[PDB]
Amino acid sequence: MRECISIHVGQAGVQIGNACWELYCLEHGIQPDGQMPSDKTIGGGDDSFNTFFSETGAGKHVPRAVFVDLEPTVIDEVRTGTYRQLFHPEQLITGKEDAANNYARGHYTIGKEIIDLVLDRIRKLADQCTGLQGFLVFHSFGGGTGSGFTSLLMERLSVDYGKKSKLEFSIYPAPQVSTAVVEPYNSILTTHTTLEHSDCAFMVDNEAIYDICRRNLDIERPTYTNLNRLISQIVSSITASLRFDGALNVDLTEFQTNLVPYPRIHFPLATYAPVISAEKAYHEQLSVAEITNACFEPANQMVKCDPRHGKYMACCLLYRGDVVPKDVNAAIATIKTKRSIQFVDWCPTGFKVGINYQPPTVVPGGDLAKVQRAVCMLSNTTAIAEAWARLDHKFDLMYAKRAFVHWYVGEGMEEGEFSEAREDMAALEKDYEEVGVD
Amino acid sequence: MYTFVVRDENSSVYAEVSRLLLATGQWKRLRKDNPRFNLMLGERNRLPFGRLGHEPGLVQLVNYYRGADKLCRKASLVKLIKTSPELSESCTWFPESYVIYPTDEREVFLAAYNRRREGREGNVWIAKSGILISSEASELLDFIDVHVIQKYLEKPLLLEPGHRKFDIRSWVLVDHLYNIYLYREGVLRTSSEPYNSANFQDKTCHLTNHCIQKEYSKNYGRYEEGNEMFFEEFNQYLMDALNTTLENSILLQIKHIIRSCLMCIEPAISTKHLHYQSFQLFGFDFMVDEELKVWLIEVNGAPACAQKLYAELCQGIVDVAISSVFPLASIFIKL
Amino acid sequence: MEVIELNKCTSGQSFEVILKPPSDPSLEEIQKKLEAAEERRKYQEAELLKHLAE
Amino acid sequence: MREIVHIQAGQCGNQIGAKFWEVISDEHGIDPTGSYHGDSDLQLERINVYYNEATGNKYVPRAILVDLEPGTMDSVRSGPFGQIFRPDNFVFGQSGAGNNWAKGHYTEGAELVDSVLDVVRKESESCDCLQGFQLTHSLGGGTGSGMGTLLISKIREEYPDRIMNTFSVMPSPKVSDTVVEPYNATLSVHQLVENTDETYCIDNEALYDICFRTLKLTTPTYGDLNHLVSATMSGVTTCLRFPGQLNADLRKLAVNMVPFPRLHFFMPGFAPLTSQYRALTVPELTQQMFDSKNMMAACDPRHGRYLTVAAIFRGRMSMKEVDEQMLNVQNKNSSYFVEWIPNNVKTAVCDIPPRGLKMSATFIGNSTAIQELFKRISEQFTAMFRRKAFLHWYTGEGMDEMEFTEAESNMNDLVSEYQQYQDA
Ligand SMILES: Nc1nc2c(ncn2[C@@H]2O[C@H](COP(=O)(O)OP(=O)(O)OP(=O)(O)O)[C@@H](O)[C@H]2O)c(=O)[nH]1
Ligand SMILES: Nc1ncnc2c1ncn2[C@@H]1O[C@H](COP(=O)(O)OP(=O)(O)CP(=O)(O)O)[C@@H](O)[C@H]1O
């Protein structure tokens, strides 16, 4: 068994972390108490769930996680929330003044003052690990803390933990729920600085989740609560292999091995199905073929883009529930004859498949209905570069007029970092086109 | 009040389309950089499809299908037909074609060439991408130095009087629901010079495109205005000369070829469940031989129109492709 | 269409199906960056206080 | 707990400041005695932003009342919520400023400014994490304009990393007390351009026209004008006073609203205009809040473009319909929004409506059309300054003509800077 430490940065990172750990406790049968009436080895063990949970002598199962935010009100809700008994106070780190949606403020000004504290708190969790394999970092692109402090943290983690893997769960900015005009700036600034420090990053576009909630959950005006509970289901599907007995993606290293052939191109597209409303009085359970076919619909992807006009480098299918290999292969065979799927020449046209017999766990009183089978597809397609193109274009529009730039310069950041970050993104787009377009 | 943008000022068809939209008083033209549009009349090259359908509160439509270039480039069209099981090698309405890169199908080319070399068959081939028609294969490869070498139809249907060859242009509109609309009006681009089966250097009687005829033919405009014969006259000719109609002898095959090509590429380019919608106007070019058999020669992704037919066709585009998505306050045959 | 490396447990199973074969900055450097930005803030503030002093 | 320190200076500043504290105390359920008597925890969750807590659960406004004469502050103390203010926070002189910027800024105000800063310091030292200051004042008088901008400069000196925000009442010949108002305003604008982060431009010309044309008030008083101001101030500070995601603090607001440091002068709006029993639909709130007749700066927004816009809807309503209508007005008039700042319109929704209304909407716009306001002041300034008219009132206080020339040039610079981005 090798432990994984989760790090939640900023409002988005923290609130998503809240939803995830709540779901984890439900999946593993852990009460808000922290007690786990199925773990017969009291006060320790090396089971698969021990990757995410440590154990006290009193039988409390504590998340190997750190919550960091430069403003206390969000984490204060964790301190007084349902799972307050779950976390140790030392795991919850709060500042007094946030980064004001300013990358430079979160990275340079405030980041410099709190980075040693956070690393020390992370160090304490690492000391409890017999064989730490790496970190899972949750944050937004658009926030000052989520963008600025994360990139500094990722830089320092590479220094203090050079051999460890680092995976990201990043929230891509969407105007329908965005809170800042400068989020394109922050997104590109943090991508440029973090790019060489992340082994694998799962981007989630708020626009996609928002529309999925409206379309499939019949929610007129989705809140962060609605969004995060859906995201947590996808995150759970991805990390399930680290927490349960299995043979696919059993460690963080295998994520890079299976999904990321080219280091810089480490942004796999996630697609989830089925998403069914709990308010739906009558629903017909979808088959293996139906939910697998849904994995190739843009409406079900975490980032709206068109994989038909790109190329695949790798594809992983993660099933949960009543699923057997025979039905998967039969589904794949039919899909291959009806859909436009193109792998790059230097990669095999195939799928790595993982099945966990336990159907997805839903939050009692949540928006999601119980299904007998679900699937999350992780595919490294060049089509996800459409998201970079959108982001870079908004960057170019504002930066050409140097709009809002003075806010970043005023925090001690040099203006050259803007163009430096943008050039790196331009190179990234060019890499995708080289791999994906003939 | 709907909004649109124009990003191709050199397009004749959509310059008229944009004019009609404004004339309704219910469409507003925005700056070409304004992202808050309902309709995009996009550019021919590197259209930013990746930035479409990401504007909250806006239904967005574009006048081009992403991926339609596979059908509208000579090199890719050949590869599409030969590798698509819906079209396959057993495609009887597309001439024998091979993709030849400059300095590949060179080996299969010469092999099927030798089938005609010492087999006593017409071994005249045409090179396309600047066009050379030759019976010598070695001469073709000399000129090529991406190209495609296609079997030249040595026995075309010749119009009388004049012993004139021609090509048929059909305009096809595919809407956002992937309905295939064939414009009932087509046009024949005719060669005003007699057909010579020995003088291939004289390409003014072998190449039927309008520009060449206007430049090198002294008989330009003799038989019809601008070497353009329309369907009413051509149908009457087929009745008088060959005792048949345009619908039976030719249009049936044309409808078949159009559907076959577009239905083949449908799952790759359809915007059925996409976050933005697409339509596109296509220009199909056909050849007709002596046996009244129709051959497809190419597909144009950004076609112009006949001057006489601009008004009707462009209004039809507004009606079935634009207003169908954005209702205001048939000239097409549905295939 | 070949199925390879099938592994089975009581929790589930995994496998791979193939349709077609193929055809840095140090701790010190980070500190330099943070301190360089800090002195730039100090300089800009010093200029402000000088301007207000006048 | 991110505290704001409130300061009100001069006659106008204290009159509108008092009404501001009357309105929001009612919204937060605070009585004139400082006791809470509301029925919602939403009223108290962020009440520490503007209020200090006292033993016995008394809530005291973090407000400082400044004037160079005791007159208006005597009326405030004798007013409705006069008792709610901390007695020590009443700082006043006896001389007055005689509607003279020089007296407020250089002579009379110079003698009193230190005692004000002593109170400012005492309030800031009690703050868990002070986020910044808000000042209410007029630009046309002497104390609010002259001593007000003096205070701002002194405050920036002691608190350089804190946000400075102002509610600045712009003078108008329609509602004028003295002919030297353009002089005082121009001198003040010069200061505001350099030393504030956010300035709400409240035009007395607009306030009068709204009372006249819309509210059907035949003879508008300053009391009628201040009713519009207090309602506007309540709406613009709503996101600061109640739980929310958008512009929840002064700095995040500035980052969203100010693309260029000098262009931070906002055109406020409010709907419905009240001096009525049927409630406005969400479409109606949206149309009116963007209407020129609901603007407070007397500038035609169609004569310019919006750099950034903040919108705040209050009351129980469909957030879906709010999103639809806000997207509608943007997509319908996209030309009036700069295209080089994508998604520059932000919308917030608070559940608690203002007093007497079930639904309301507050508009905050950074429009280039605000140059019409400064152009207006500039013309009135030059008309007198070309003949050096009424200058002796200022040179008698030690000022030189050069300082007037510099102030005039810098405001004309500000005007051309707006024109620059209006054409961009
Ligand atoms: N899906 C999701 N997105 C969120 C959530 N909270 C914020 N966001 C998004 O994150 C961006 C704002 O960043 P935040 O995480 O709020 O900022 P922060 O990291 O707290 O940094 P500062 O507050 O600027 O110090 C916006 O694009 C929001 O849409 C959440 O709970 N769920
Ligand atoms: N295999 C073949 N047999 C006989 N004639 C042929 C031929 N291929 C091409 N041609 C003739 O050559 C002419 C031009 O061919 P091609 O379609 O390559 O040029 P083009 O694409 O520029 C015309 P457009 O673009 O206007 O549709 C056609 O009008 C046709 O008559």
Ligand SMILES: Nc1nc2c(ncn2[C@@H]2O[C@H](COP(=O)(O)OP(=O)(O)O)[C@@H](O)[C@H]2O)c(=O)[nH]1
């Ligand atoms: N809206 C409003 N404007 C006022 C009020 N009192 C004065 N003014 C305006 O403010 C200017 C006079 O400044 P004043 O505040 O009286 O001077 P001070 O006391 O020296 O700051 C003139 O332009 C007046 O029109 C008021 O109560 N409300």
Ligand SMILES: [Ca+2]
């Ligand atoms: Ca155990």
Ligand SMILES: [Mg+2]
């Ligand atoms: Mg935050």
Ligand SMILES: [Mg+2]
């Ligand atoms: Mg062509």
Ligand SMILES: [Mg+2]
């Ligand atoms: Mg007065």
